[model samples]
Target chain A: KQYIISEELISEGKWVKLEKTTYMDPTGKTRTWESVKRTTRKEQTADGVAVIPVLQRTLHYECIVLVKQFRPPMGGYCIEFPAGLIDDGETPEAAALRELEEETGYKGDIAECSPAVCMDPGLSNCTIHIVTVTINGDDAENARPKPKPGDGEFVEVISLPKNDLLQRLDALVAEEHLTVDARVYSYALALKHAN
Target chain B: KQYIISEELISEGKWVKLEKTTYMDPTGKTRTWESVKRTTRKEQTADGVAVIPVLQRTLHYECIVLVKQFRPPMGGYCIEFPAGLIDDGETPEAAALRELEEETGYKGDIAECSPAVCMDPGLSNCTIHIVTVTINGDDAENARPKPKPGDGEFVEVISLPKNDLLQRLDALVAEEHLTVDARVYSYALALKHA
Candidate 1:
């Protein structure tokens, strides 16, 4: 039962809006930059929903936990880091832990966390904090991850080898099986031979 | 000098819309996924505006080309790789070259190009083709990169050392200067000590 209900409005509930901003450049020239606001929620509410692209590596950093899912916008499956929005009253790190467990059923210790980073500044104001975690194999609880995405999400968990991730992604692309996310693709490229 | 005009409609040119998608899962259960589509342009025009984060390595891969600009969405300046939309009838490589030159006034040779990749698949159809380029020191044209963004674009060119990009970025963040793009952040992490 698939259906699309279209609506007419200049804006929706805290989803997105088009805005024009004018500021004086260093040269005293007034410039107008057309920008999009992805959220209009109160600062607190907006901050709560800002976490993403968690990178989880298995014991000894041998492999990284990844997820594959059918992204409606892309009209195909995509390989991406397991990610989720921060829950109410939750720290970004706490949210990452909850999302990692809920989405892939694997728990790990956060190895590093990047400062909030914007995905596309020209188009949207949406930002994410990239958190890297290490899942120890010795921890019997995480040896085998069990995906338990909530009713709204359909996810397939895949443990990609740290060193072979780029090759595997290339093979998938060549076979026209799936597309990779930009952040993940960049990570793969940077670590192609380094790891 | 700036004013925003809003309108009501089912769609806007190259903007976005919300939709519901229903499909069967492995268990044969019909499910519906609420998704967003960020484009409505015809395929031809829609496919034209695609380019992305260009990685330019300097002599001995010592430094990389980076740019800083005010991203209204974030209400602050952002450190990101030089990028731009491909002009009509232009190949991705050609677009990368033009954007690099126009944005930073630097020239380089394409070192690598990755297949088109999506940034946020669940929310938007927008995708980009990552192109890596090498700027040899022997090239007189690239001996000194000068900031030369076109009429409307206000960008600051920064030649960030590859070895200390992460540290420098951290220092910037610590001083409340600028935020880094996620892709750039990941690249810095991947290249950190590796």
Candidate 2:
């Protein structure tokens, strides 16, 4: 049974009134939860929808599988596939292609990755759409280098063959990089469907 | 640009301290994040390891997911998976099995669904070992019922074929499920692998 909040507590508690509420109980009964506090301030839509929290940026800021370094938040560097957010008004397919070039330095058509979202929906409000794109090492080498982030921005770029890359994901999850849960999940999907 | 926490914020933040560290940065820098508060109760460990917040539990009476009702948390109630804390002496795998039988009134071998934490480890200091098991409808129908929560803890079981189940997950993420972030990630993995 939920502890019914008294009127006094409702007034006194530091309440951050939610307009466009996103996260709710599975049963859809409660309106507000007590002792609720905003842990981190992420990007919110104009209508007040809080976008998902991405602790680690996709490989080179693209949505394809590649080598990854250990992140401070996750505690160890490991290999990961790549992915990026689609900007406002952009379709998932469009963003997939753009991110492919910006992050991997490879320009290719994203045929179709499953139009899927991440499983842990509580942390973020955005949808993660993946697309399967053709890649060639020679094409990637000829692509322009992505710009490095300023001062506090830190990201390391590494490349791995697609097959070994899959093995690395398994190793990372079995060993260290399980915290980057979304990346591992998406990679597993890619591996299963990859022809 | 990342702002270096000056002495002011460090002193004011009063983050919790850790005894044993298990984190390293990209440059192989081992560092620890302090929590905002510490638990007054201490759990003594058999191996001298301190017990931290590893398993986050939803209160017994908290509103959990219902099988058919779409979950706002994961976007839909598609086969509501109930998870709980790993008991004091229970193994992760054991806990997963116990949770399944107790919640769904069905027992089966623990099939490793995904061996990973629930969400971001940095934010929540917990790792969830998820295992999905299948049980026949006849078994559930024939099993003796356990004690029920007086608060009308009845669940409607909806059986969808494997393909339909996968499609439901997709629909839940697109429209019904509220957040569509974390659930999408986990569901995608389960669909692809499990």
Candidate 3:
């Protein structure tokens, strides 16, 4: 059985923290590993939220709303779903909607919700709730949705036909030299896998 | 219009590091963010690899191979695909097969591969290649697959039918009190979506 013995703080900052933890392995060997974590996560709420906006326009296949932004960790811009940290005492759905509206200016209807799923468990304990949203493109105001990103936020919105998302993402990589987030790429791969 | 200006080291450990990066945003306003990075990643090789092992047994729908292990960061055990960091001068595929065989003791054939995909991009710069592998369960050697996990590695392998994977995972959550990794859950969701 694996169990932790103790933890020591390696570093801390405004948003992120690092810890070195010693644990017992199957052989009872005391091994230590470093972990990256967020300091902004509230105890009662999940770490964060990601919104998958499914769009529908008249006489067309469903489309998906995605955004591109520069991530310091990634060292460049990355294409990803609208996402943000969950505010204290806020539902993942509420955070997802809030983030989606702020980044894409598209009000959406709840469709599907996933449990708190983790990312990079081997390295970090970060987790996020996936909230799929439905957006009707026929609404007049939605034709040219304007974003209202918060301070220091720079997001570019992109919409593509869901049927051709993988191809579309590939084209972006070829023409724009951009990389897709694994989660978004996973969605596209799943779409392809399903079909 | 965001571009990095400069990076300053905040702290660094044997394998992990913290950096304070300053960048100019679309509005030409300067901003700073902290990023976490791995010191083990080779220049040409990816940061790591994850295998989606698809198993084909006699008279049954395809089942997928998954593993559960205690993650210090998670402060508990997590269910995820078999994964490991790549070595210097190694192809992702080569590294994946090597890791898969070391941890699961079942050699597999490459079926499909995803390009370098990142996890928690907003938080850290960790990226890995998703390599899907096919395992022939009817093979005599594979009938009773035995694992040889590495030092300090404690992996519990579980094989489940693909058709009912989502339900199976949900059952694990309720019955076993274990949480699923997002990428693994994403794969299941896509299975349901498709």
- Using DockQ as the measure, the top candidate is 3
B189 Cα displacement, candidate 3 (Å): 1.0
Instruction: For each candidate, give the TM-score of chain B.
Output: 0.77, 0.48, 0.96
lDDT of 1: 0.65
For all predicted structures, in order, the TM-scores are 0.82, 0.54, 0.95
The C-alpha lDDT values of all candidates are 0.65, 0.37, 0.84
Model 3, span B1-194: residue lDDT tens:
77789988899989899999888878888889999889898684469988888888789898878888899988888888888998898888988888887778778988887778778888888888888888898888778878888777878898878887888988888887566888788778767766
DockQ of 3: 0.75
What residue runs in model 3 are displaced by over 4 Å at the alpha carbon? none
Better of 1 and 3 by DockQ: 3
Best by lDDT: 3
Error of 1 at B118 (Å): 0.9
By TM-score, the candidates rank as 3, 1, 2
Give the candidates in order of lDDT, highest first: 3, 1, 2
Between candidates 2 and 3, name the one with more favorable TM-score.
3
Docking quality category of candidate 3 according to DockQ thresholds: medium
